[PDB]
Every structure is written in C-alpha cells, then in structure tokens.
Design a protein around this ligand. Sequence first.
Ligand code: ADP
Lengths: 53, 244, 53, 100
Amino acid sequence: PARDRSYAWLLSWLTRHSTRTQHLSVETSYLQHESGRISTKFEFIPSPGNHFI
Amino acid sequence: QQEEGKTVMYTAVGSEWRTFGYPRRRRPLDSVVLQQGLADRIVKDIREFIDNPKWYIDRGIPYRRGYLLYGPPGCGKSSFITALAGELEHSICLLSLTDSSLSDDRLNHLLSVAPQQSLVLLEDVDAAFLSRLTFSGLLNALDGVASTEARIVFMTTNYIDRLDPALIRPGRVDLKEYVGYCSHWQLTQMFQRFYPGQAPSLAENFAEHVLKATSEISPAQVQGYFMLYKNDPMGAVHNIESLR
Amino acid sequence: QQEEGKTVMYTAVGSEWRTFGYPRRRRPLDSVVLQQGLADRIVKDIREFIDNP
Amino acid sequence: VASTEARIVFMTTNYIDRLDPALIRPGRVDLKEYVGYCSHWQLTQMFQRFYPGQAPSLAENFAEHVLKATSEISPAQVQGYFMLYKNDPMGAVHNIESLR
Ligand SMILES: Nc1ncnc2c1ncn2[C@@H]1O[C@H](COP(=O)(O)OP(=O)(O)O)[C@@H](O)[C@H]1O
C-alpha cells in the first residue's frame, strides 16, 4: 500500500532497473530555501497501469 | 525565469537571528567597481571554497573561511559584500560588534547559530579590538568549532594597523584585500555605468581631470557628484574643475 | 544509500539537554590519526561493550 | 545509579597528575589512554592524507626532517603548517627547515 514506506523505494528501484519505461509519471522535489534559493529536481516514476519487468 | 532573487538581511537581537526588514533587490555585481581584478580574485576564491566541500571534510579541516577588507571609508565595501551575496544567492547576517549589547559568549552563540547558506558581516571590527567589549575574546570565539557548514565571514574596517597579525591566519581571516581610491579604469567604468553610452575618450578625459584635481577621491564622492548632474554628462564634465 | 549520516551536538542549559546548532557532517575516522593502535584498541573496546549488553 | 542504558562517558584533560587514582576504577573511567606528539608513522600518514598520492619516500623524509627539527611537534601545528602550503607538497618539504 501507499501508506507503507516501501512504496516509494520499490517505485524508485523499478524506475532504475527498467531505464526504458515508455509509460511513466513525474515527481518534482521543489524547495525554496531562505534567501530565495530555489532547488528543483525531477524524479521519474512508473505511471499507473500495468508494467512488465 | 519569472522569479527574481532577493537578499535577506538577518539582524541579531539578544541571542537570536531575526529577519530584519523585507527581502531586498539584489544589487548587480558589475554595479560596484573596486579595482582591476580584486572582485574577480575574491569571486574565484569564494567559488573554489564553496564548490570543493569534499576537500575540507576528507582532510579533517573545518569548512570555514574568512575575508578582510580594509580601506578608506565610503570605498564600497558593504555594497560589494551585498552584491557578492546576491550573486551567490546567500543572505547577509549583519552584526555590529561595536555595540556593547552583545558579549563574547553572546557573540559566539550568535556566530554559531547563523543560518545555513548565509554570510555574516561584522563591521567596525577596530572598535572592539581597540578596547561586554573584548579584543581577544572575539578572535577566540571565531576559532571556536561552534559553527555550521560553510561559515563564510567577512571583515571590514577603515584601517588595519589597529589589528594584529595574529588575527590573520588559517582558520581565521584568510584572504585580506585593500580597497583604495578610484583609479582611471575605475573612474571610466563608473562614468560608462552611470551614463549608458558615450564617447570613451570623454570618460578618459573625465577620469584624468578628476585624478588631477583630487588624489584621494572616494567612490562615494564620485557617486554624490554624479547625483548632482544626473542625466547631464556634458555639464558634469565641464564642472570637474569646480570640484578642484 | 542516498541518506548521509549526521552527528548532533547536545548542549546543556539549566537542567536540560538542547540540540545546539544544526546536524554536522561526520568526520571520517581515518582522518584523525592518533597513534599506531590506540584508535583500534578504543574502537574494539567500544564495540565489545556495545555488542554485549 | 541515575543514568540510562549504555551511558558512555569520555574524559579529556591536558594533564593527569592533577587527578587521583580513585577516579580510575571499575564503575568509573576504565580504559585511560595517553595521546602524544606525532611520530614518524603519524607524520607520514598525515602527509599522505593531506596530499592524495605521492612518493612514500618523500613522506618519510618529511617526517624525519620534522622529527629532527622539533621534538614536541603537535598535530595541530602540522595541520596549520600544511594549510600554509595547501596544494604545495614540494614547497612544504623545502620549507621544513624554515620551521626549525
Ligand atoms: N565601487 C562603487 N561603485 C558604485 N557605488 C559605490 C562604490 N563605492 C561606493 N559606492 C557608493 O558609496 C556609498 C557608500 O556607502 P556605505 O555603505 O556607507 O560605505 P561603504 O560602501 O564603503 O561601506 C554607497 O551608497 C555606494 O552607492
């Protein structure tokens, strides 16, 4: 389930093991530090549906 | 691209850092002209220090660096510090050690709890050293390990003779620089900055006339004189002899 | 593997322990060289003490 | 007995003569150790740590020169001297005699 913390770990492991995943979603890590410093990074995650590995 | 960076000043009350005022517009670095290559040297040193954190941690040396700027008043020290902080996207934590409100322990606590990715500026360093107030307590507190990652500290003073060579050492002030009066290159750079587009020969003549008239002309005086003849380059050039 | 360990300094004010400063980067053990085998002896003693409650 | 599980306490001091043997006992300080000045092995380890990859003979000569120059050299002094000649091993080696 999404409540368990293994969800994100398994999804990251999937997106690493299967580099060429035609179907995927995006997770953006955005953090505006003090003094107006903006840090952004795109983490790509498998899209909802069926995937084969 | 629609977000404009800002510089935040952190003031100190009691034993805490507070966000003084509102976020300020970042002054462009090229606006402040100190010397031929002092700005480049300082920027390069700061970039090298920041971009190599693995060097310090592996050798077990504190990730702390300090700079000192000594010169005549009104030479553009604090302005350059603000411009550098804006370029590095850091925040300046201005603190006046000349005030007797803070003590040596209070100074150490404030310097140890400084916000991350933030610069700390301690002006009028001569006053405390000349004399709550202490002369060696501040330098002892500076060498204390009570700090955070990348504690960049800037020293600014009107004169350096009042201090001692013991202050300048590794683990302390590292790259001291002397800011001086305007030169021909500095004067022509200021003239072309204030007035966007004119004859370079006119700027050279202006700089030569100013150098002939005054030997210890300060950039603050130059800016004040330019304010008098705002949007008036020819009148300002004709009025150089008026300054004498 | 993406998490970096940190060391937290606890200071004491009054009769309480307070988290002084921010988490610090952990200095590698090999960075500090004391003697030929003093570090090894101390580490071994500490490991024996901890691992045998 | 007012403590918690696994209360590890470390004692550090400049000199031990000011204390008493009563402090060192089971239920108290257990394994006391004396940290001393840099040795040849310590000096060469520091030299190879600060500079990642050089001739071990150069480090040995550096350590021998430091030992000859000073007998009570402290590691803090060694680190401070290395900071002066950061990214400069040959100059530091040539400047060992300067320390005297
Ligand atoms: N190199 C420079 N370029 C542009 N303006 C300068 C320069 N040096 C000084 N000034 C002007 O002089 C004033 C100096 O004010 P102040 O901050 O009190 O002195 P300092 O800048 O020496 O700390 C600033 O308002 C700034 O606009």
